[PDB]
Amino acid sequence: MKTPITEAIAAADTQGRFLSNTELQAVDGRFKRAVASMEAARALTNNAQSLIDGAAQAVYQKFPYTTTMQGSQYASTPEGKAKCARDIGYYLRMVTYCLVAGGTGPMDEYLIAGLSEINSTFDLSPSWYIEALKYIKANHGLTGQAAVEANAYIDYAINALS
Amino acid sequence: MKTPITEAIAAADTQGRFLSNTELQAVDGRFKRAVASMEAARALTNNAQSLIDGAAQAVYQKFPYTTTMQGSQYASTPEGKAKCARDIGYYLRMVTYCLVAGGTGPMDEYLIAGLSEINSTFDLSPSWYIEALKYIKANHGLTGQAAVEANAYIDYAINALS
Amino acid sequence: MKTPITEAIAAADTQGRFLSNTELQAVDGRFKRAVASMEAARALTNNAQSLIDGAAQAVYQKFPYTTTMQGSQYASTPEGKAKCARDIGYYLRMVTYCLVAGGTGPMDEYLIAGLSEINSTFDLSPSWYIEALKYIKANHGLTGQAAVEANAYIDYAINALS
Amino acid sequence: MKTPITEAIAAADTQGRFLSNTELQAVDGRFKRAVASMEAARALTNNAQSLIDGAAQAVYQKFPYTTTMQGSQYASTPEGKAKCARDIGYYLRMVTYCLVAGGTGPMDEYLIAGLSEINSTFDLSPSWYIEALKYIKANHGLTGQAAVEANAYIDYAINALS
Amino acid sequence: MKTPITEAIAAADTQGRFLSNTELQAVDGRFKRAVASMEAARALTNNAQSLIDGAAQAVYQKFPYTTTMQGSQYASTPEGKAKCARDIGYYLRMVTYCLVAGGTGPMDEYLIAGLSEINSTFDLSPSWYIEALKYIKANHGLTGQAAVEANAYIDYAINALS
Amino acid sequence: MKTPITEAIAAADTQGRFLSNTELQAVDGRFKRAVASMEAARALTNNAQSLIDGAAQAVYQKFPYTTTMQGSQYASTPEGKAKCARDIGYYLRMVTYCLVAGGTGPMDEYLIAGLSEINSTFDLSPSWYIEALKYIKANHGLTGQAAVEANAYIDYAINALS
Amino acid sequence: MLDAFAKVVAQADARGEFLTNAQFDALSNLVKEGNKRLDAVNRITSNASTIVANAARALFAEQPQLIQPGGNAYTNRRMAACLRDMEIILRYVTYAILAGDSSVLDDRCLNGLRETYQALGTPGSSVAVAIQKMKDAAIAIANDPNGITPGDCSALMSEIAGYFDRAAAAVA
Amino acid sequence: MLDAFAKVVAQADARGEFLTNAQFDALSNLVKEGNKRLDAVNRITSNASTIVANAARALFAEQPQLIQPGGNAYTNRRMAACLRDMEIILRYVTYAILAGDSSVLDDRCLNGLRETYQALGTPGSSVAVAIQKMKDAAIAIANDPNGITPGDCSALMSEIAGYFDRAAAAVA
Amino acid sequence: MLDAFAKVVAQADARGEFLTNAQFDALSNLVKEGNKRLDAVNRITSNASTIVANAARALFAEQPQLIQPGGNAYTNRRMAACLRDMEIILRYVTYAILAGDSSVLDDRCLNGLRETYQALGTPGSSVAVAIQKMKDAAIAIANDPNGITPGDCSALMSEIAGYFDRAAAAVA
Amino acid sequence: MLDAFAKVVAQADARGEFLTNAQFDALSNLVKEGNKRLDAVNRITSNASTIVANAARALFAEQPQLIQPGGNAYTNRRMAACLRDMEIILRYVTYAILAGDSSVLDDRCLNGLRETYQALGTPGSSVAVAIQKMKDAAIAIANDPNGITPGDCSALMSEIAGYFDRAAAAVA
Amino acid sequence: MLDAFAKVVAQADARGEFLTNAQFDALSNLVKEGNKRLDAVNRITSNASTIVANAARALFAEQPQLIQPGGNAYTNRRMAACLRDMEIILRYVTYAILAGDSSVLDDRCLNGLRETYQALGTPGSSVAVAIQKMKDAAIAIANDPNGITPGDCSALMSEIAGYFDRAAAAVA
Amino acid sequence: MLDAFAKVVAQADARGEFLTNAQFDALSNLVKEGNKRLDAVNRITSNASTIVANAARALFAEQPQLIQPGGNAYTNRRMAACLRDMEIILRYVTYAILAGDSSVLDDRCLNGLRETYQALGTPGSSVAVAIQKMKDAAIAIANDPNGITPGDCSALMSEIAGYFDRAAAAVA
């Protein structure tokens, strides 16, 4: 899983080399940034329900047809509404895991790999998810470097959907 | 040349990826460690002559035969003495370049690559150079994290000769 | 470009072999099927405007939001309406080219290659295009083997979007 | 085994693709040509003995030395005569199998692969076999497309021996 | 061209190594065997015409049909007779070149490479050439190690035709 | 193991070929040189103790520090003296094995492979061993081709250490 | 790979025999029914994306454990692999239908599949369910009497079902 | 590679156009004359070994310098290469006949051939002679009126000759 | 590849020199301004998909010839390639910003690019336009005064613009 | 490969859970003790050549059978391999220390090692001895109280010893 | 691979020993008999094509089941493979004769051969027969008293027979 | 590659000729002088490390610009490459001496070398100096009258010098 520590190791290993000071500096950078990352993680986690519930409404407000149109890929039945809220919660949980790990590895492995295939096969629009992510970014309540950390991983997801 | 910044770039590039937060943390780690690294660099530079001259004597004291034995690979003529002082100055200059770059790249490229071949072909003993490096380590006058930085690159060289 | 004739040649060529009877049978099959394929091509061509104009309306009726929602990727301005009609005409023209060539090569080369990237980057929904293709299939006015030929290439496109 | 159907499949498979209309046309071509191919197969089969016996005599008439010269590779003993008639029957049986399969696969697999090695090692002249094949071609009694089918596979064998 | 000297070099070169005593022994073996090889070469050369003329007759006596049968691949016209005598002279000249070089390189390069293709394409029987070579072997007039040398290269050719 | 016989075989094998006269000449060269090689082997063996004991003293005379300097890599204790005499005996035994095999294979496999790594890791100077080999070369008591054989393998070792 | 014609040839070659009149007649009969076989392949293939998607959706509705966190088709990588495998199996079933012989399906798809799923921890019984649902959808589409010259494709449908069953049996 | 149909499509695609009635009619006409084209390919291919061997034998009879010691087709390796090149050129000419377009011949065979022969020291004018002799033999065989339903294959023969000439011009 | 620090080392190594006090001071100053450089890279990268998409859309609005049938960005394969090249160039510009040196951009991206586009028939002047539009968008985003500790990033913006200009000059 | 943080994430992902306050607190605590972990890796690595050489020399003093003619570390090729393996094992132990997790050591180094040594005839019990001697030297160097800010690194030393023991157990 | 000399060296190296006078004498004796060994290799090799062809022809005369339709040496591909294997085995037997040691034959030819033939369904007992017939022909040719300086090559013939027997035992 | 014997054969083959008595006599004479040639190769090779080291040391004493910082043989990588090239050139000169023909040296070493050094910025005139110094040392060692049966090796020394000169001319 891609983290600043497993990247440093993998680099030394590919060259058959002991760790050097180049790599230990990268880990120190990770350990110092963890203060902001962990602030962001804990906040997002604590406020997860409200963020998830708000984000789903933002989707439905931007794209009203998703609440009316007939078909299992839409949120026009109770089952669809539940699938949608479930998905949005996956995306937020993956953001929290990135902040905890210090990199994109968890989102890359558990969500991005296969994402294009999934959306095409089940007729899920990328723009639905982008809208939910934009809501989380606007409404997470963070500032300073904690906000920079959360937004970096939210915007990574947005780019992956674009 | 291997530095924490060119490592971060090379990693993203091998995967065809934009830089992510994993990489920008590694660079921040480098920028914060540079305070200690640059202290060490400047000190070693300022005191280079005395360190070089002292280190060469330490070699000759550990290995007296190098001052008497006939042959161009030894320091028993003025020309040999000058070659030896020149070499020791190369090693110290390379240590200063590592501290400036934040990694082993300069020493790897300009001195380590080919080092085994050179020593064998010209009948230069690795242990001569290890002795000079041990003197520099004992006598550089640094403490705290500046000392940790200088010693990491001196000990890297020692390991490369072992 | 993939046609039954260039497939037959490519096969013999990969094995460094003259054409054999296996390959000449495949070409004869193509020449006999061309009667139905060319009926279909000419019909679709003759009725292209009405099919294109009808298909675009079918899209707008299935997905009314595409006629109202603000954004350049939608058909809510004259420019968007023209882009959409242009695209639908590309899809039908590519169907006619497949029927003329006797295979999928023209659609594969000029439209399918890169299709996923294009739709994602410009935020075009695959389902818009599937709806237009379903309209063409229901309304082309063909029967018998001409209909089987047209539908095979329309359904190929649908599968490529799914 | 190379037939128009296994070629069509192999082609789709190499590209990881479902069968398309390009391939189903090739199979239809095979199914329609089978009428002539099966006429030819049945005729050759029904008249196999007389064709085989006639062809062997044609060899002996063109190359009289093969009936007199001492050595196990010649037809100057009863055992040699039987080997020769056996071989000619193999060649005709392989022609019938090509017509049944709709391609060269059976002759390629069971007779052509290794053919140069066999003839060289056992001192069998290719021209003996070409003469037998020319007799079969002149005397099979077919006309129209059945004759075109039989001759295509006979001439394939001749080319393989040349 | 394969000789004991170019083999020794090629071996050292493939391993990026200077010549060693293993290789210089192989060359000495070649230099000492050259006494017998050069005896054989000179004899064959001096008696080339009579050997060539005798060998061609031996072919015609073993295979009388080659003097009567109609076709340009046979020796039933003056032009064919001349082609055959020319070929036999090529084979003997190549034997002399092997003895001069100390290995099979000249015969391998100028005659064996492509030999199977040539004989098949022009309908030349290998056994014609084997018969000529057997005559040369029986009638060269050499004994002792000169005979062992000549026969080794004649029998090499025979094996290449078998 | 590299000998003139296993080289000849390996060469034929890489080309999928029977042995030819090129290879059998190389073996004959080996069999004739064995007379000198075996003279050299037996002499060196018979006089091994005195050569080994003399060679070690020559080392100590050239490099007196090796008898005084503190450290397990030197010959300043009884254990070091024994390691050094043991090593010199390995080198001479490997020379005798080369002469017996007719090539460098035994020295290559049992001593040269890994030699640079060993000397660097245990801080053994190549020049110590070169000095011992020069003594053996000056004092083996051989002349003529036996001397050429012994010296070729001694000088091979010297080059491997240089 | 063999087709139906190649298989009869191979059997005759190992006996050293020319074909019999019964053998010839049996191959002729396959040829005469070939338009039905081409229709079946064209219809199934033309509907491949929905056959896969619909069977997948049903599977996961009946077996929610497969998509819950920790389940074998949880995460988009695992889901994409699961969907891929459905399309692969359907692809090789349709090759078998065109050839009139299971050899391509057996050799290129089913051989070693059971062992692959065991090593992964993929539930083969659930793969079998997926297959069965594709079989049912495929046959329904293939044998739809609308929009085609009327006739009896019952023997062909039995042959198609047997390939799907063969696949389902090889993975569970 | 393009066939005759692909080439018309490509031209229409770069203009953004559906086919015209004249274009459709021209492709239909090719289809209607296709049995002639299949006969020509079958006949040439079926006689490939003699077309090559006979032209080679004639070449070397007219140009003995090519086979004398030191000549470009002296030694069995060089002769085998020369014979290979004749069969290659004939092979790619027959692909062009099946396709009704020279693109496969131009792209896979003729491009860079002139320069290859210059670097080798192979005489391209002599290659051209070989080609011309194969063209003459091929057309004679293709257009033999015995053993075939009678009709006029003259336009097709002109098209075949043009491919051979195109090859001969590219090497000299 | 070199970063800003490596480049000063390389220059000193070819002279055989330890660094001067001025050299040390110049590197120290880069370090002290490094948070600005990390913000610029994070902001540009975080907006990469819109920077590319918006510039592309504008290009094709101003230059409709590029997307008309026969144009270099007509067909989805060509459009996808054109979009790829925009993302590539932006990717290597952002590496140059992190490194403070153009070497990675010059060596891995720009070298030979002009010649590649000439051989393809791609219009480099139009590529340059695309670049310029990305530069303008990137700088605007990088240097947005909202949501960041206030300060002066003007020298850094000039450095960023120079990399984009260097790219635009290398392709036209 | 996993680090300590990745392992907690993986465990939460298979349950479908956000982290708990206890989990967060445990990761925070690792971060707060990270300077100790960086010192330990820097100190061990910086002394790697002597840790290996000294343990090797001791091994062979205690086990002279290993270097006698016929022994597994007799000949310079075998000795160089034996020394390589010591440096490899130490290298992967230090990666595990940086990561705070054994996965890299288990997956890239220890898996299959026992079986490799059995097939070779290398004595794994003697490898284990070598490991144990490196562990003792490494810990002594890591936990040297001279030249470092004073504090308690006892938990970390227990963790380091466990990685070395894990290695020694996997080879014997 | 080892030759006779290498094998004595290897044995002495594992004991840490210089050669004894008996060992030296035994190698000297091999050298002194080397012209016989070179004659044997030259004679066998020079007759390789007939040794193989004659043994093959006899095998199939005695075992007609092998060439009947369905038999393991029926079809030209299988026959060519069977003939190849005879020439391979003879080739590696002659290497063993030149070396005076079976190691090349054991390591490059015989190891795993039994298992290869079992997996194929090739009858190893019939391979053994083929070998035995080549052995008999080879020895007859090697030990022909005509056209060679007279002497006693009986020990050498026993050594040659043992290599052939070793081969025959390894495949049955 | 050719040796002296191969070159005479090649020349005769292109004329279609058997060797003349003069040609035979010239090859015989080479054989008769072969012990001298084997001594020369053995002596040069046996001293290769000092021939290279001594010439290198002299070069750099005469041309200090080559080792000063910024010079082409400054840095251990560049020095190791420079030393490698000396050993390569000497290696291929000794192959030429064994063969009695320059073809191996020309084809495998000297062809394209001038252009390689131009592209690098390596001074070929300085390479030539290195070569000349190796030539002088090599000839002195080869032609040392001590410890060898006395005779005249003057023609051979001229031949050896010509190979070294050929090398020196090809790089400057």
Ligand SMILES: CCC1=C(C)/C(=C/C2=NC(=C\c3[nH]c(/C=C4\NC(=O)[C@H](C)[C@H]4CC)c(C)c3CCC(=O)O)/C(CCC(=O)O)=C2C)NC1=O
């Ligand atoms: C190019 C490779 C090469 C070969 C092949 C070669 C063979 C060779 N065989 C020899 C002798 C011989 N070869 C044999 C062999 C036999 N005598 C018997 O009657 C047996 C049936 C038979 C069994 C193998 C005999 C008896 C000698 C004479 C004794 C000796 O030199 O060992 C001789 C000595 C000269 C002579 O008497 O003709 C040589 C050089 N040397 C070569 O350089």
